mmCIF file of C-alpha atoms in Angstrom:
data_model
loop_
_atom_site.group_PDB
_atom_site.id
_atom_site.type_symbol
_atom_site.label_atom_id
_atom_site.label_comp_id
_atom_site.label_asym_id
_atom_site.label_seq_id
_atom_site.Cartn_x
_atom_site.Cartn_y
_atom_site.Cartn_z
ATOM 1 C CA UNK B 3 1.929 -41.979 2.844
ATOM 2 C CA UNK B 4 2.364 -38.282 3.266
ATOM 3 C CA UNK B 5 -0.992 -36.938 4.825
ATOM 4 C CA UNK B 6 -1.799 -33.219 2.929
ATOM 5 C CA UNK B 7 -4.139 -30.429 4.236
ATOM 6 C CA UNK B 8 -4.925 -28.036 1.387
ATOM 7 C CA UNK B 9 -6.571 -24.269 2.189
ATOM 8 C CA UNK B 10 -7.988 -21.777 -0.376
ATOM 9 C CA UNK B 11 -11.584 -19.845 -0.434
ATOM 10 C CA UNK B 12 -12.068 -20.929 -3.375
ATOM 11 C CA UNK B 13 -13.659 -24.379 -3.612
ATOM 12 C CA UNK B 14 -12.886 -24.993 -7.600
ATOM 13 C CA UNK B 15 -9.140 -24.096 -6.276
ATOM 14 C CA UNK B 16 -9.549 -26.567 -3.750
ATOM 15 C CA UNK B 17 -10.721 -29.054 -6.489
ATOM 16 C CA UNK B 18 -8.106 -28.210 -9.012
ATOM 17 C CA UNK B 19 -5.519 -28.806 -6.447
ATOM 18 C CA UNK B 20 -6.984 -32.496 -5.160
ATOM 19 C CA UNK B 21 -7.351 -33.258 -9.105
ATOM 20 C CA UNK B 22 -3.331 -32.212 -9.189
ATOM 21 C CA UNK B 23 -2.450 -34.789 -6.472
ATOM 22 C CA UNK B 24 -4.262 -37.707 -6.572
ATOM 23 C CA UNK B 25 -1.707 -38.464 -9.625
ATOM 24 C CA UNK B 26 0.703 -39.280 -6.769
ATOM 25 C CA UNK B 27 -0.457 -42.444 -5.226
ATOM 26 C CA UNK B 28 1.605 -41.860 -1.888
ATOM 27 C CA UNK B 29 0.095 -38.862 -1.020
ATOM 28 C CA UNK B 30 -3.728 -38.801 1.125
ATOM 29 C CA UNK B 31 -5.719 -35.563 1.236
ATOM 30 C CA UNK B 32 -6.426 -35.347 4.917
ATOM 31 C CA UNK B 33 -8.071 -31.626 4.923
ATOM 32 C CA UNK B 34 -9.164 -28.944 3.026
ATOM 33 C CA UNK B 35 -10.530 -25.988 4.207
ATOM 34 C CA UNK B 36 -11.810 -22.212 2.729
ATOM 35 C CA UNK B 37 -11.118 -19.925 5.635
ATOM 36 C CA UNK B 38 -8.241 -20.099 8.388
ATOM 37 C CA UNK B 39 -10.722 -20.328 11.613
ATOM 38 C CA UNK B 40 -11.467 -23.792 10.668
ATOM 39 C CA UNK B 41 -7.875 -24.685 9.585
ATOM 40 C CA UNK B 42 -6.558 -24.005 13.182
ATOM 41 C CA UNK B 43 -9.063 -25.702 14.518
ATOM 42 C CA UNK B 44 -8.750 -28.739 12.914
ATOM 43 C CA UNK B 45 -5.007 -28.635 12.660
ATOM 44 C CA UNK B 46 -4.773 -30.613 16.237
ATOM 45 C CA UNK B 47 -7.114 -33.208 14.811
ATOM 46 C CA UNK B 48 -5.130 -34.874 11.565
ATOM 47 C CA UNK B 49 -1.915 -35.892 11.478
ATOM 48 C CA UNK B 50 -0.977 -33.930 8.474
ATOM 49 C CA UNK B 51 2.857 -34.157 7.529
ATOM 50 C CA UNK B 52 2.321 -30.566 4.990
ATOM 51 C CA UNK B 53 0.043 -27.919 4.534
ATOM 52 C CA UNK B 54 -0.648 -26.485 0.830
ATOM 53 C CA UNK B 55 -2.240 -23.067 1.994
ATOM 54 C CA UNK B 56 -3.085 -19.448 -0.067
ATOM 55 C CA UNK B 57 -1.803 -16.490 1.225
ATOM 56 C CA UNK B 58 -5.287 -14.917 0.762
ATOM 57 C CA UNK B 59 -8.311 -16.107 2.719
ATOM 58 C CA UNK B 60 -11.033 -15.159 5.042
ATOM 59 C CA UNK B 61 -10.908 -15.638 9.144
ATOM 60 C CA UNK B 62 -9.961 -12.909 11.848
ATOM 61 C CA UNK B 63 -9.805 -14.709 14.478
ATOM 62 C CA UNK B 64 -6.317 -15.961 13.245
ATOM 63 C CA UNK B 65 -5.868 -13.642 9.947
ATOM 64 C CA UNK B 66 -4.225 -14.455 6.605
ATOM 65 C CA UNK B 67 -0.993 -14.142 5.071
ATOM 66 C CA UNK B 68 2.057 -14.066 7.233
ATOM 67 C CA UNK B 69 1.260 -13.355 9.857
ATOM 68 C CA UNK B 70 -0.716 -16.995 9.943
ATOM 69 C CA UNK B 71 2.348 -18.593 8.860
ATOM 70 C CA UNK B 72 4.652 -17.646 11.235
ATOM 71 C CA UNK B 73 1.594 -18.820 13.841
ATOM 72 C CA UNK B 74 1.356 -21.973 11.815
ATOM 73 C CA UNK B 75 5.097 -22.941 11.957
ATOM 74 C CA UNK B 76 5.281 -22.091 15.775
ATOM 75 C CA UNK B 77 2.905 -23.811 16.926
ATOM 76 C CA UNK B 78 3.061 -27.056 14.404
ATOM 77 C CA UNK B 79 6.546 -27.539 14.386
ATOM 78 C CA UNK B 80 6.505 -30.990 12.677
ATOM 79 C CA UNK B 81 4.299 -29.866 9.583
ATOM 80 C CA UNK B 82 6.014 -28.843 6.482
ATOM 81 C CA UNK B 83 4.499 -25.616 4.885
ATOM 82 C CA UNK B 84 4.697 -25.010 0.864
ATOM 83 C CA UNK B 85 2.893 -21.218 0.668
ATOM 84 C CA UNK B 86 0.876 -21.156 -2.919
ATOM 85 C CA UNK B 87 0.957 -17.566 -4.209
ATOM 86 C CA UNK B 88 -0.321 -16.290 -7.381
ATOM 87 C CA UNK B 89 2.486 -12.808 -7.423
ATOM 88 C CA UNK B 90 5.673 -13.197 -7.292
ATOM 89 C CA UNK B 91 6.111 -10.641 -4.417
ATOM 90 C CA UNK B 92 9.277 -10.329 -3.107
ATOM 91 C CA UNK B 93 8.328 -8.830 0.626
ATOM 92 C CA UNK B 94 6.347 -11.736 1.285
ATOM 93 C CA UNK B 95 8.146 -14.442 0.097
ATOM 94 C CA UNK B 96 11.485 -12.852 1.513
ATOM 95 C CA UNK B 97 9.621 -12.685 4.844
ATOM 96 C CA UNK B 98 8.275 -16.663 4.393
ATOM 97 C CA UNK B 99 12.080 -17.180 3.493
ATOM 98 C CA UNK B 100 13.301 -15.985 6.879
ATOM 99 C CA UNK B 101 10.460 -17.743 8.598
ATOM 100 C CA UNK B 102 12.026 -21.258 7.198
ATOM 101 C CA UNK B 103 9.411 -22.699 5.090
ATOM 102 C CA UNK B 104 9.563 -25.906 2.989
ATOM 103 C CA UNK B 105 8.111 -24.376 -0.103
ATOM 104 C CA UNK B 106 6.558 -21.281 -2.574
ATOM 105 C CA UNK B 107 4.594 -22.455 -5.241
ATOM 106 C CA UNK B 108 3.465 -19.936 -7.923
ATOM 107 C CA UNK B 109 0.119 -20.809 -9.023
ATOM 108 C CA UNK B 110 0.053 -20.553 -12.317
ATOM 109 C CA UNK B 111 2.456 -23.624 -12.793
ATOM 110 C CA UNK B 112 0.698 -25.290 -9.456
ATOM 111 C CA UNK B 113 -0.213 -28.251 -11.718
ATOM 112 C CA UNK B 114 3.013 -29.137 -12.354
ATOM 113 C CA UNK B 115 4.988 -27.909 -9.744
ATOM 114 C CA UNK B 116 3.249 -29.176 -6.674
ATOM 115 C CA UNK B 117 3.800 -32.648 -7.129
ATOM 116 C CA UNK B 118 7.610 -31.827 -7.787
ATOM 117 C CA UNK B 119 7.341 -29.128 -4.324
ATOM 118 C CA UNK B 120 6.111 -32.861 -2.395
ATOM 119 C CA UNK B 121 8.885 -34.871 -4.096
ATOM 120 C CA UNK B 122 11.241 -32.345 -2.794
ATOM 121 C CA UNK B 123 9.452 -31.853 0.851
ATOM 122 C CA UNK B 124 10.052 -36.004 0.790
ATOM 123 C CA UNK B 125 13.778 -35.943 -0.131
ATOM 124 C CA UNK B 126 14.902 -33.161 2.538
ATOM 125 C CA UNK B 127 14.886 -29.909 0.301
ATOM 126 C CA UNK B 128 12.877 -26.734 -0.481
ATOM 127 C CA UNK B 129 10.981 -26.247 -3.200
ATOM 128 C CA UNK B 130 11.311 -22.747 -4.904
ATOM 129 C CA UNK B 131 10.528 -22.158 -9.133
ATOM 130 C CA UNK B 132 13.403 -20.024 -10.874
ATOM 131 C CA UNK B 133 11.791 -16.931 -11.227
ATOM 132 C CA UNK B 134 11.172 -17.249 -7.088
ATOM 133 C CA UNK B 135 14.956 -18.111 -6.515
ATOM 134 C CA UNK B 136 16.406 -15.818 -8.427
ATOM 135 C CA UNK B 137 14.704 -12.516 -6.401
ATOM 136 C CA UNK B 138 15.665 -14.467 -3.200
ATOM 137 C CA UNK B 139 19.161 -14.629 -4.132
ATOM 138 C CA UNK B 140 18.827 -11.066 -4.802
ATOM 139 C CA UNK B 149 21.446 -2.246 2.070
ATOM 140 C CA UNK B 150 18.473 -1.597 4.733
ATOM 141 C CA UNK B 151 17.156 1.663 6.132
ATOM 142 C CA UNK B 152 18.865 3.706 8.265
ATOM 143 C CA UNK B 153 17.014 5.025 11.039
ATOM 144 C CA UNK B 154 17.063 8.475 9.817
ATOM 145 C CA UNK B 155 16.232 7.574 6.263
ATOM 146 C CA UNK B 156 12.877 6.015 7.559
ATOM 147 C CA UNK B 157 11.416 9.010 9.088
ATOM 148 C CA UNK B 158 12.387 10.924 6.450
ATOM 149 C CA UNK B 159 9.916 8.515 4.069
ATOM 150 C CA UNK B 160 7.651 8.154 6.876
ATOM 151 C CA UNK B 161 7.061 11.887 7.086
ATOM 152 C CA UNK B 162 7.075 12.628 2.743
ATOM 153 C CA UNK B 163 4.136 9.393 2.894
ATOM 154 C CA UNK B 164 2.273 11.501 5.663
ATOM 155 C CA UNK B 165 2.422 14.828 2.564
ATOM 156 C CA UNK B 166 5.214 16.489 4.293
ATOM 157 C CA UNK B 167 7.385 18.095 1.544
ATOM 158 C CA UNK B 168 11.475 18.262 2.066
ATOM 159 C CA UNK B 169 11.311 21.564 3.635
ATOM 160 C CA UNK B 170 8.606 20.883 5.974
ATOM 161 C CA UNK B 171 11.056 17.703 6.782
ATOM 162 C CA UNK B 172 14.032 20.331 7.466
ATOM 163 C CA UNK B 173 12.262 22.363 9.811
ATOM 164 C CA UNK B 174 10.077 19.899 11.889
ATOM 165 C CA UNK B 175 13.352 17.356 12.556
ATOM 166 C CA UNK B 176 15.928 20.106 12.251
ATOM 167 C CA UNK B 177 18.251 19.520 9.917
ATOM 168 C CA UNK B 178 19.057 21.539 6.213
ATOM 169 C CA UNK B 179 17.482 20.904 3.047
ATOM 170 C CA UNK B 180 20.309 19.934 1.691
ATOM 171 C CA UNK B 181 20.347 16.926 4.054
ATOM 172 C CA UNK B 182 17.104 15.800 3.698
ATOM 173 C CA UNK B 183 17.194 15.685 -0.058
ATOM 174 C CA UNK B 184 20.330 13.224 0.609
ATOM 175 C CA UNK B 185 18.791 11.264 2.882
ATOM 176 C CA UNK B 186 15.413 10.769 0.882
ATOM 177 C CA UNK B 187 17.485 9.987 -2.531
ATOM 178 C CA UNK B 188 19.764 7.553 -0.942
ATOM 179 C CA UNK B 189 16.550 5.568 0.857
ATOM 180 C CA UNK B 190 14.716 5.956 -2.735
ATOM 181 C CA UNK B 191 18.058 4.246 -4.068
ATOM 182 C CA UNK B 192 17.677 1.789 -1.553
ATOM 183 C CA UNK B 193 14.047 0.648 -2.180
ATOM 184 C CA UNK B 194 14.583 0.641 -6.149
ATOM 185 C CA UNK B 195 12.388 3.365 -6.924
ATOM 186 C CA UNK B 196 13.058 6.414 -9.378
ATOM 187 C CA UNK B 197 10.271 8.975 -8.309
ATOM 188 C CA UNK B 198 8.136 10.617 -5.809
ATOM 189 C CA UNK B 199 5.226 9.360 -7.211
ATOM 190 C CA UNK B 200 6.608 5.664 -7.904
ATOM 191 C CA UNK B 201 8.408 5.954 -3.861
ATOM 192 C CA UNK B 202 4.351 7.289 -2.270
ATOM 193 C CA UNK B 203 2.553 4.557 -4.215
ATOM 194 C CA UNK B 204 5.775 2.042 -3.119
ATOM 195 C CA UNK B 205 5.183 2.733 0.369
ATOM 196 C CA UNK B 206 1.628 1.806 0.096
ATOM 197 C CA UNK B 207 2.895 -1.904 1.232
ATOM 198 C CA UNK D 1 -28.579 33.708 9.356
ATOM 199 C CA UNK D 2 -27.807 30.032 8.198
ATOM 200 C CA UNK D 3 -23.752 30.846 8.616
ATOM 201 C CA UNK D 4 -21.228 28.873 7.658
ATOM 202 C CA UNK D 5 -19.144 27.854 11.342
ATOM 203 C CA UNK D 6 -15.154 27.737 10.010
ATOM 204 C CA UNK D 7 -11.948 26.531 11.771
ATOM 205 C CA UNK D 8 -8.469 27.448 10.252
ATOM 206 C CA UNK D 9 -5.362 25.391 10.719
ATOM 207 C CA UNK D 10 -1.993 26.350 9.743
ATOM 208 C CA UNK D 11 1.132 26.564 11.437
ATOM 209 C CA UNK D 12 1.976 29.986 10.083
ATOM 210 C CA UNK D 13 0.059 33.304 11.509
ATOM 211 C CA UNK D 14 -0.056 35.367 8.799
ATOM 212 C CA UNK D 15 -0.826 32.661 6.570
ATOM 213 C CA UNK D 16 -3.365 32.131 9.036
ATOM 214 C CA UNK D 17 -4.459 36.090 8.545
ATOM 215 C CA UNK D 18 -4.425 35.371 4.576
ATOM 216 C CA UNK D 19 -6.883 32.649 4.823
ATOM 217 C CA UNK D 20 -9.187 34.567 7.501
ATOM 218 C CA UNK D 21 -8.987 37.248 5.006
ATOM 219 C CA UNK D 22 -9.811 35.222 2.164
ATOM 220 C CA UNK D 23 -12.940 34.884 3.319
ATOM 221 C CA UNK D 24 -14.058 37.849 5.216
ATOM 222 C CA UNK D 25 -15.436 38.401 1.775
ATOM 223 C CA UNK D 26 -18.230 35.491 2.278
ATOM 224 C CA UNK D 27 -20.474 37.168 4.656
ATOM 225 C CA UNK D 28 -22.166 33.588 5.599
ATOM 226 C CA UNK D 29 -18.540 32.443 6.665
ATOM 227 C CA UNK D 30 -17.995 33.207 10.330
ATOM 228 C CA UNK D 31 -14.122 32.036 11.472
ATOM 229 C CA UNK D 32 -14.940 30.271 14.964
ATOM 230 C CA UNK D 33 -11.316 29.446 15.540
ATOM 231 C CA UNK D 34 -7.873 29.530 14.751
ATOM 232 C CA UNK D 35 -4.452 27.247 15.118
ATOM 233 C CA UNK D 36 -0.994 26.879 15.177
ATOM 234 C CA UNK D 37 -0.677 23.017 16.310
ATOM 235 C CA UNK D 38 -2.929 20.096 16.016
ATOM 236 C CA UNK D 39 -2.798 18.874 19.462
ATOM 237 C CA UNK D 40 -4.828 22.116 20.612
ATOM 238 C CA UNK D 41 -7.122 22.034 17.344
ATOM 239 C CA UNK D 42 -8.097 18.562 18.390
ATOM 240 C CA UNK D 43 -8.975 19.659 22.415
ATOM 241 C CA UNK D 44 -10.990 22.703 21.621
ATOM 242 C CA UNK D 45 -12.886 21.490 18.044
ATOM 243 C CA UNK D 46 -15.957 19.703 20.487
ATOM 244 C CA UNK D 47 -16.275 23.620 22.387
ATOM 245 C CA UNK D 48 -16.539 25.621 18.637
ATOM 246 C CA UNK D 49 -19.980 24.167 16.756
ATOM 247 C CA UNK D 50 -17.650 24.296 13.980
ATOM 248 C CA UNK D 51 -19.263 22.863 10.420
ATOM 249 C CA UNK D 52 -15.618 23.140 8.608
ATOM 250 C CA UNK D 53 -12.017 22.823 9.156
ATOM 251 C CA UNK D 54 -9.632 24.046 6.869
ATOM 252 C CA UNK D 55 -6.192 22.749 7.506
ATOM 253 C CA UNK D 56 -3.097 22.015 6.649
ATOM 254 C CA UNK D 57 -1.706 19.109 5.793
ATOM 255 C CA UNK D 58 1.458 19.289 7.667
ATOM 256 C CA UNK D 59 1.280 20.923 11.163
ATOM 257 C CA UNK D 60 3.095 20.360 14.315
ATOM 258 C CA UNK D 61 1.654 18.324 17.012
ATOM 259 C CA UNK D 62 2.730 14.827 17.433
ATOM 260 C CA UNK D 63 -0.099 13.689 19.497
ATOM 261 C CA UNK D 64 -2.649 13.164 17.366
ATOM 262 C CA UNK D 65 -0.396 12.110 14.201
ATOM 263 C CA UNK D 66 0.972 13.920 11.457
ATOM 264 C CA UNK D 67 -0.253 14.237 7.758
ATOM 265 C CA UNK D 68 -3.020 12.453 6.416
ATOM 266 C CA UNK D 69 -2.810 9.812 9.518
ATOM 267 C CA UNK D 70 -4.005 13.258 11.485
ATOM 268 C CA UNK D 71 -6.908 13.744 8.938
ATOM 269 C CA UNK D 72 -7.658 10.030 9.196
ATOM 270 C CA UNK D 73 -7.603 10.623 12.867
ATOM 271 C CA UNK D 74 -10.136 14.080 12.762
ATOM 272 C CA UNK D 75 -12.380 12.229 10.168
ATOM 273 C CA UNK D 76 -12.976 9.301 12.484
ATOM 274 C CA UNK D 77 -13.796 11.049 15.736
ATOM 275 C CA UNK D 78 -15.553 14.079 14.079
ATOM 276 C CA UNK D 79 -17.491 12.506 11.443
ATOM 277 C CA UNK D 80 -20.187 15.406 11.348
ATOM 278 C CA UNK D 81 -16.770 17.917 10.148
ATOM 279 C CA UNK D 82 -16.551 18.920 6.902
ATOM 280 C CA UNK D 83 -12.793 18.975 6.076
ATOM 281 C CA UNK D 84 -10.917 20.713 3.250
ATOM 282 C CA UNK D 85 -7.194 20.304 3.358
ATOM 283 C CA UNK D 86 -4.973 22.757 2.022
ATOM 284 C CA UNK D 87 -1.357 22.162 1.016
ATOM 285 C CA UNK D 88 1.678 22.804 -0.616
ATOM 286 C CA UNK D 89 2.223 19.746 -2.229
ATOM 287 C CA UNK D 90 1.558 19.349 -5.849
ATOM 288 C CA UNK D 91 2.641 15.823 -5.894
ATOM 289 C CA UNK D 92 -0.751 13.896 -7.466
ATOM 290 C CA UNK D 93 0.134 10.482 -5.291
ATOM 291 C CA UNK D 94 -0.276 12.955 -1.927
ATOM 292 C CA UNK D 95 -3.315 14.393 -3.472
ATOM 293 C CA UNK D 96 -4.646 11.375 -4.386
ATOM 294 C CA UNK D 97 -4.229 9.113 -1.118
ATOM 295 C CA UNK D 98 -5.817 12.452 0.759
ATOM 296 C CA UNK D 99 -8.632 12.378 -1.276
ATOM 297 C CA UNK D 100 -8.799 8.595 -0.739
ATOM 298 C CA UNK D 101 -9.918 9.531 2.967
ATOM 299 C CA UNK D 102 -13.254 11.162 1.601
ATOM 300 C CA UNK D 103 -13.042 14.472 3.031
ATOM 301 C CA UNK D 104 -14.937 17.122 1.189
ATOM 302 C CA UNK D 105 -11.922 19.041 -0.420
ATOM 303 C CA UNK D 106 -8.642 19.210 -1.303
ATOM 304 C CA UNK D 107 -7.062 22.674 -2.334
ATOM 305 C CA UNK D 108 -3.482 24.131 -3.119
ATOM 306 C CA UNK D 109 -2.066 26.460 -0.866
ATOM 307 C CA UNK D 110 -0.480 28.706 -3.357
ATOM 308 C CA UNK D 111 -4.194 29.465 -4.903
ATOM 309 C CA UNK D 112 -6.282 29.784 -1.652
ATOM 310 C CA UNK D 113 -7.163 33.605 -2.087
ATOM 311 C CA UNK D 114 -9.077 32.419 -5.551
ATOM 312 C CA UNK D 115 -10.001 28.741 -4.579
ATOM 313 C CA UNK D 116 -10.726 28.310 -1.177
ATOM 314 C CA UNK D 117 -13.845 30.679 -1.955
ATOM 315 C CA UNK D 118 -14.937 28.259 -4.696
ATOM 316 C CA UNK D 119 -14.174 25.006 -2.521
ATOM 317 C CA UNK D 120 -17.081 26.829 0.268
ATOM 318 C CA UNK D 121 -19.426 27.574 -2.200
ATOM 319 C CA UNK D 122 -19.136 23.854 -3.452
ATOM 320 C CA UNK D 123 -19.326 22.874 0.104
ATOM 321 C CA UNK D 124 -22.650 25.062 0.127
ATOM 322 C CA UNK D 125 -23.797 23.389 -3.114
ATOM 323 C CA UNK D 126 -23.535 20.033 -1.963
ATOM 324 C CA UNK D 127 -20.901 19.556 -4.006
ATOM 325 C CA UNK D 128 -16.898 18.335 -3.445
ATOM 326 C CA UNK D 129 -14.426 20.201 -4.560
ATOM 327 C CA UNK D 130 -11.035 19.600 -6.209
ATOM 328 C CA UNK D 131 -10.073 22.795 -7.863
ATOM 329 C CA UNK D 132 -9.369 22.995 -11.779
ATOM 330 C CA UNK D 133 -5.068 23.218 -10.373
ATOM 331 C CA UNK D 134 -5.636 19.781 -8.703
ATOM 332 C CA UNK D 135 -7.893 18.092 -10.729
ATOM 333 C CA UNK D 136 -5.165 18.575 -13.329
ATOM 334 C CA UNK D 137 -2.596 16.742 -11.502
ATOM 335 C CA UNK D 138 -4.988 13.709 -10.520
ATOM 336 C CA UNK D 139 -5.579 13.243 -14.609
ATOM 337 C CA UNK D 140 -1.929 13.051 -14.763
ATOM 338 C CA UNK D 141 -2.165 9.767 -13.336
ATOM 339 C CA UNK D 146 1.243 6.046 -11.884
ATOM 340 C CA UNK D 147 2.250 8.632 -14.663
ATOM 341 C CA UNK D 148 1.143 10.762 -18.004
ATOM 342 C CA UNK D 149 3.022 8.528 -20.259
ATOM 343 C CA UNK D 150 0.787 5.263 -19.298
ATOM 344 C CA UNK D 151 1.409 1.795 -20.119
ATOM 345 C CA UNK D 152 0.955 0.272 -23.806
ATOM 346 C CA UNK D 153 -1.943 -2.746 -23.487
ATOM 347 C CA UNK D 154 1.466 -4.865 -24.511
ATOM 348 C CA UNK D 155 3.385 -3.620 -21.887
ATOM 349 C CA UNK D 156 0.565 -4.472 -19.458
ATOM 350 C CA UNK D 157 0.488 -7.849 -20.354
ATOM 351 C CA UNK D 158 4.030 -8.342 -20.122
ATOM 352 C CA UNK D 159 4.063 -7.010 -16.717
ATOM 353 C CA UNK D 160 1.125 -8.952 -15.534
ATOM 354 C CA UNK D 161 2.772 -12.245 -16.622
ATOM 355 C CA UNK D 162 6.356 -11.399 -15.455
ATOM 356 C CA UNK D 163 4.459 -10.653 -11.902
ATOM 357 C CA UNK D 164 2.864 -14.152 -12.111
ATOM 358 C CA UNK D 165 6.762 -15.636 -11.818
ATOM 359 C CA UNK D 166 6.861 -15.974 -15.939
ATOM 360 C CA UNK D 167 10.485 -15.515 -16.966
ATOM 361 C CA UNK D 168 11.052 -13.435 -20.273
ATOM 362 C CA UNK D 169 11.939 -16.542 -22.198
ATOM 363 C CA UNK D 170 8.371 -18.039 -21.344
ATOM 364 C CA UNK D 171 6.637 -14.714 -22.167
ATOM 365 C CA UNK D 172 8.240 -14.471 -25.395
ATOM 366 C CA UNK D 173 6.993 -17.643 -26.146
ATOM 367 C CA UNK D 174 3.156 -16.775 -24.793
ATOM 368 C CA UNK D 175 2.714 -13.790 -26.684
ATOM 369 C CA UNK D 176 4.325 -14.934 -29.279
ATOM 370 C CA UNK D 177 7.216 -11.949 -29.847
ATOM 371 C CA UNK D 178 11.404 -12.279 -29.793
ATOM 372 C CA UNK D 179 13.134 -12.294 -26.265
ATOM 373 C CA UNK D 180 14.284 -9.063 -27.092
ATOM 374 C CA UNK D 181 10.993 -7.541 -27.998
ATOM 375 C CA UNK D 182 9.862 -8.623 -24.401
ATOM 376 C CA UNK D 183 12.678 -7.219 -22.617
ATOM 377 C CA UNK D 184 12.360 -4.218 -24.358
ATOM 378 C CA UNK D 185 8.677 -3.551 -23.523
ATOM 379 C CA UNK D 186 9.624 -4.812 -20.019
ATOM 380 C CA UNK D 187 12.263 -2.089 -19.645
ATOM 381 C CA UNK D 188 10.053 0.373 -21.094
ATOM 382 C CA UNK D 189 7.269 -0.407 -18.769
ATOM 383 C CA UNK D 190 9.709 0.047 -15.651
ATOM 384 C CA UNK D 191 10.408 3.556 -16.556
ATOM 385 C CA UNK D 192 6.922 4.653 -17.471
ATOM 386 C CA UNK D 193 6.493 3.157 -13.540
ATOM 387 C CA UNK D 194 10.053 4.294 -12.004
ATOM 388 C CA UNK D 195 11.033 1.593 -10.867
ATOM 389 C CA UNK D 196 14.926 0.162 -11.797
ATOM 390 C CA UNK D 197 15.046 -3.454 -10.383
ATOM 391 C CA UNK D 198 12.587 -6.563 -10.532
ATOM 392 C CA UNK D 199 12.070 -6.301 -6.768
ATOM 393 C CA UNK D 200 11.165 -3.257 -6.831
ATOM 394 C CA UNK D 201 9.347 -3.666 -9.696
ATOM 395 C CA UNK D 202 7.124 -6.889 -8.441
ATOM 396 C CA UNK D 203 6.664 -5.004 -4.878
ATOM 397 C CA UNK D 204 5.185 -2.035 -6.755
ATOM 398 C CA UNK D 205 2.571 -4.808 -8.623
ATOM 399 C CA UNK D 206 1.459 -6.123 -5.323
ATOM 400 C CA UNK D 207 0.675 -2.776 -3.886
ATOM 401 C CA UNK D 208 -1.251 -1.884 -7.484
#
């Protein structure tokens, strides 16, 4: 059998998702746990083969999101991770991409895509739905460029920009429009609220 | 009498001057300090028995920060302070995120002579003040032209990892329909590609 540890805060989640896999008669529900502080803790305990985890959940003492991935997948190098995400949300699944995770699960088609996310996990290969795939098939910052945003998030306007890192308006303007480029965005409004995350 | 302690920040003098000015009018204002740079606004505000700051929003001094991470900064280890920033900037999503910090006022630059009065006597009220010129832009507002209840739906779903051929189907409206109202929305928002778009929905 493949032993599964599920984590969510929210216990009907947690239920929904046990209710989803005991369909598949070779996989046993080892753990599941509402908060990340009792996940690590008990991670050392069962001999889980993958972890079905939220992004989203309570605990300090470890965190959330990627951060407890990445601490996940260092220090359990043997357990197989599929992240279940309600957003499609490109800066965190590009950065659960890099960190070499066996799956994204979206959860409004959790249902049917988990057990298919497991199949996969059992055969070798990742698990990703289309509308995932497609933005991760999908030109960085320059160094300049950054403190040029940095400054316009912090309510500097182009000319304050010039004068405080000494360079013409002219240049500034550039560099902002070709970072805005960059990042996708068409206004100043659209780039301040971007920059937000 | 019960005066009004006030500390002026801006990195210009005579803009400095105009301000002091400004309210030499208000004879229960009493200016207890002056600055060019944040770095010696933030060493000699626990000397002044200041009640007010009025500052700029972008100063030099790297020290302490720059920008609203500088007002953050002030708020935190002067809580008693009663801030009002004044700036330049008319853009609403600067206006917005510094009143976001809960300071006590936010006021343009260009209309200090008639508003920075008002924004003291509010202060003396007990009252906040945004000024009829900013409260204008924050009504503008992520833009004038908002999003159709259709459009929001759309978006919602498409940010859940629906494709437009599953949407269509949902709502119950032609592919093209969908894209259409999809394309629309990501103007209304600025935004010109899907990852930028679904970043932006994360954030909001």
């Amino acid at each position: 059998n493949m032993n599964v540890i599920i984590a969510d805060d929210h216990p009907i989640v947690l239920f929904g998702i046990r209710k989803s896999l005991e369909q598949i008669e070779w996989v046993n529900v080892v753990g599941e746990f509402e908060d990340s502080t009792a996940l690590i803790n008990n991670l050392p305990k069962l001999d889980a083969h993958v972890l079905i985890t939220d992004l989203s959940m309570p605990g300090d003492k470890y965190g959330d999101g990627i951060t407890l991935i990445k601490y996940i997948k260092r220090h359990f190098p043997s357990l197989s991770i599929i992240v279940l995400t309600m957003n499609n949300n490109p800066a965190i699944l590009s950065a659960v991409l890099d960190l070499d995770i066996e799956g994204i699960v979206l959860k409004q088609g959790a249902p049917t895509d988990l057990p298919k996310a497991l199949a996969a996990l059992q055969k070798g290969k990742k698990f990703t739905p289309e509308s995932v795939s497609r933005l991760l098939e999908k030109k960085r910052l320059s160094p300049k460029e950054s403190e040029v945003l940095r400054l316009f998030a912090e309510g500097f306007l182009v000319t304050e920009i010039a004068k405080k890192l000494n360079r013409s308006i002219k240049t500034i303007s550039s560099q902002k429009k070709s970072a805005m480029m960059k990042l996708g965005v068409e206004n100043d409004i659209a780039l301040l609220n971007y920059l937000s995350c």
